Ligand binder design. Structure first.
Ligand SMILES: *Cc1c(COP(=O)(O)O)cnc(C)c1O
Ligand SMILES: *Cc1c(COP(=O)(O)O)cnc(C)c1O
Lengths: 389, 387
């Protein structure tokens, strides 16, 4: 049915998920799967979490939609929660990570234009970066194969290697408006920024009067075991973007910044009432000491399994990432074959991810039960075993 | 300039075409959150779809399909020229997908140099850098650094201008069959058919932005059906989810095949919860009875607007299609649209603008006759206060 209905932009699994509860999912044939993928780090509280269902139902019988002309109570409440918990003084709500990034990039550009010079236009970004698939965001993204072939790209974007501080210093000048970076490049093989690199970015932005833009669409909202990855590093950005985990499955996103920067464009703008209600309930759960502590407990449970799998099958050269964003890089013998293990995983009843062709990625619910971790990782071990044999 | 609500106008509850704020003041909703809540607030069918799917499955990623998405895709394909659909979150994203597709199709089918996009003055297509550059308001596209190039703007309804700028290096013509933001201006039959013929001649794709005028708004499922002019690509949002963030890009198999695995496009797009709600909305809007009702209701609004002009002498033109209504103000009241809107709010009726000279109405497609009369009596009161 897929090939007959929707554009040839995706190559989906043979099975169709129909129901989810917690970190378990069922297809049309009733086959049960363990979810270590979370729809690519989106369902951070699992499927149909009672508190998120409650919020959806309660707001759903009250008010769904206002235009950006009006504010609404769920948006104001969520805005306040994000402002109180972060560096942010102002928040702008959208629907997707791409839109949040569009907003952040446009703001950095416009801030430079009005506060400094219309010629202050250079955006520094990184190879293997992913920021979305709109023309602008994909051009800021560091994957030419995704940005090629759509006509003239928005100009004045410069790409250098991730974690290469000297390259950044080399390209930055008084005509630079922003540095855009994922504190951890999720799609780009789960590579975390070094402390010196991220700190260095802050110093260079300060020097050249450019804005440091953190894309935390994937690595934000508790993913790393801190509310946002920047908190782990102790490096404060000028602008931050958040989505995916923000709504635990509901299409929602946020752009966070200071009042000084926001004024280039109330403490909150926009935000769908239904979306913000759900994101509010999601925030309330994730931003607790115990949930954040548990993310680190759960990571080591996952990592110990991956270490045991490697001890058995000689398969991983590296296990990396932060919190419940986990990357397992394949050894040279299994290079380029990440998709093979993902497919065998699904056959064994476990849903995993890739991060390029050389890396297995895990992004489960932040509250995934210990029992589900052990069962799912046993399934993945069997899947690995089938590929090896 | 921009219309913003004060601290004492915060909507907290909606029921049908009525809205209440924090202080419990009741409003009649003729705005629909800018033509979004096409079935009113908290419609029982849409609430039921939201709640039931909400207990089952909200989100899988696009490396999976889902039943609600398949069901909705099938319904759109069966009812339109479309053979393939791509689901996204917003009209902007749908337009991004459409414009990228037209560009990529030309690149692979003809030439990497076939890049020109023809768009129109006063057009609105969204607020991403690309979509706002295709949009026809330079004030909204200025000041964000280098714009994506090869976009040419000409006046809406000016066929000769289009003919003049089009060539073998043109990949697309992008147009709203009715320009909603741009003063509620409908394309003439000659103009829109002319666009089809020119796109045929130059092997360019005709892209209809029906984000505002689509999904029943005009009294047809899509505005293109009224005109009898079939586009190569169509975009839909707003009314599609009746308040739930959802959008769709509609095209043929031949065009869709230009995209391969990885060409696009989304994390949320194709969302099981979104598509279930949109399915329920589609099922209600795409019925002869609701679509007939839209024309009945339009005339009820128009008769009130005519009566207001008879008493107050404020309108020079009443236009639009279905329940997308534009009422242009007379020269003596140029630039007063915002003031009539705020006076409306004071009188307990929510209306829109379409530029500083035009009043816009985009109510629920099933707005009750009683709400129409009451709300327009409130608006007639608001007008009297202004004049
Ligand atoms: C997934 C992701 C995005 C894209 O967000 P959408 O919701 O797909 O628009 C952008 N940036 C990063 C780092 C991401 O991981
Ligand atoms: C409202 C509108 C859009 C924007 O859609 P979003 O959902 O706001 O991204 C684009 N084009 C037209 C014609 C519109 O009316």
């Amino acid at each position: 049915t897929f090939d007959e209905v929707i554009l040839p932009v995706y190559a989906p699994a043979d099975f169709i998920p129909v129901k989810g509860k917690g970190s378990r999912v069922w297809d049309q044939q009733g086959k049960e799967y363990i979810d270590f993928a979370g729809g690519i780090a989106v369902t951070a509280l699992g499927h149909c979490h009672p508190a998120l269902v409650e919020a959806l139902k309660s707001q759903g019988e009250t008010l769904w939609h206002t235009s950006n002309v009006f504010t609404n109570e769920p948006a104001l409440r969520l805005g306040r929660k994000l402002i109180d918990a972060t560096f942010a003084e102002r928040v702008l709500f959208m629907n997707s990570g791409t839109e949040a990034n569009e907003t952040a990039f446009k703001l950095a550009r416009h801030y430079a234009c009005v506060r400094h010079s219309p010629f202050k236009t250079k955006i520094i970004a990184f190879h293997n970066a992913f920021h979305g698939r709109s023309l602008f965001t994909v051009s800021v993204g560091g994957q030419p194969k995704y940005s090629d072939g759509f006509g003239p790209k928005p100009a004045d974007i410069i790409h250098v290697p991730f974690n290469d501080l000297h390259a950044v210093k080399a390209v930055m000048d008084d005509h630079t408006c922003a540095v855009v970076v994922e504190p951890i490049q999720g799609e780009g093989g789960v590579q975390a920024a070094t402390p010196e690199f991220l700190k260095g970015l802050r110093d260079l932005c300060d020097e050249h009067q450019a804005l440091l833009v953190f894309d935390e669409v994937q690595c934000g909202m508790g993913r790393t075991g801190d509310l946002f990855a920047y908190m782990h590093y102790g490096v404060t950005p000028d602008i931050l973007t958040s989505a995916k985990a923000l709504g635990g499955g509901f299409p929602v996103s946020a752009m966070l910044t200071t009042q000084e920067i926001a004024s280039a464009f109330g403490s909150t703008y926009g935000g769908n009432p239904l979306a913000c209600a759900v994101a509010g309930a999601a925030f309330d759960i994730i931003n607790t000491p115990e949930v954040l502590q548990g993310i680190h407990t759960k990571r080591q449970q996952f990592v110990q399994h991956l270490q045991a799998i490697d001890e058995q099958f000689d398969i991983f050269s590296d296990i990396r990432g932060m919190g419940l964003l986990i990357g397992a890089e394949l050894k040279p013998k299994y290079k380029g074959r990440a998709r093979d293990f993902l497919y065998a995983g699904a056959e064994a009843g476990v849903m995993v991810l890739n991060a390029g062709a050389d890396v297995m990625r895990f992004a489960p619910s932040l509250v995934v039960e210990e029992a589900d971790i052990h069962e799912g990782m046993q399934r993945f071990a069997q899947a690995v075993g089938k590929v090896v044999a």
